[PDB]
Amino acid sequence: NVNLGRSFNQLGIKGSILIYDRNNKKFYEHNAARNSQSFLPASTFKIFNSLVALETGVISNDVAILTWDGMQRQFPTWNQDTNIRQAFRNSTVWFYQVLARKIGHERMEKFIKQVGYGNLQIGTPEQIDRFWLEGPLQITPKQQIEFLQRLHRKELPFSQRTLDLVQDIMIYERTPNYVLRGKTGWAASVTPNIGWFVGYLEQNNNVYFFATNIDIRNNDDAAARIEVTRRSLKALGLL
């Protein structure tokens, strides 16, 4: 028995978290109702997009380069040539928009439905480079967990090579005791903004899948995406 809502109220943020203990098939959560509510995936979709891009071969491997088009975008790290590992690290949207266009609407829809990702809606072909940023694609925190867990047990239609590459670029933090993988998200086209941190923790010969979802009403709220995840995992004796 642990109060996972404690971290949320300390940081003054509204949101939810869902943690799934793989070995024990057990959930821990705060705000269960929100864990079944749908939100724009934003950059968390890069996990799914990376799998399909590698599987279809529109990007050859983790070091293959896509070049910057010269347009000055919002963040300086985005204004440079990159690969999928650094684009994942930097939340480089334009890189993943190229991947989605090259996958194409028909292949994207097939993988979305085969995987069962979120609400399964990517819109019209004209929305191929923005359906996860502006809609209509949405996903619940529970569905983030289901996707990541199915991914990890090799049920999805991706080769072992594809899985190995994506699981490697997801590495966020690593010590001798644990490997933390995940991806943040920040949907800014809705009010309030929606913050994500989803992924999974490998520790103590177990895997703990997590999905954090918060309201972002000022820029200081954004840092709480990872911090509430950290405090939640430590409340369970992890990290």
Nearer CB in complex with Cl ion: 94/186: 186
Least Cβ distance, residue 96 to Cl ion (angstroms): 14
Stretch that binds Cl ion, among 44-52, 161-169, 178-186, 231-239 (CB under 5 A): 178-186
Find the catalytic residue in 16, 43, 50, 91: 43
- 43 included as an active-site residue: yes
Closest residue by beta carbon to Cl ion: 85
Size of the site for Cl ion (CB under 5 A): 4
Length of the chain: 239
Distances (CA, A) of 203 to 168, 176, 216: 16, 10, 30
Stretch that binds Cl ion, among 46-54, 106-114, 145-153, 183-191 (CB under 5 A): 183-191
Least Cβ distance, residue 160 to Cl ion (angstroms): 21
Residues 7-36 that bind Cl ion (CB under 5 A): none
Considering the rule CB under 5 A, would residue 85 count as an interface residue with Cl ion?
A: yes
Residues 43-82 that bind Cl ion (CB under 5 A): 75
Residues 6+ apart with CB under 8 A from 131: 121, 122, 123, 137
> Which segments of the chain does DSSP mark as H helices, in order?
5-10, 45-56, 84-90, 93-103, 105-115, 131-134, 141-152, 160-169, 219-222, 224-235
Nearest of 14, 25, 11, 45 to residue 187 by alpha carbon: 45
What residues act catalytically? 43
| Interface with Cl ion (CB under 5 A) | 75, 85, 186, 188
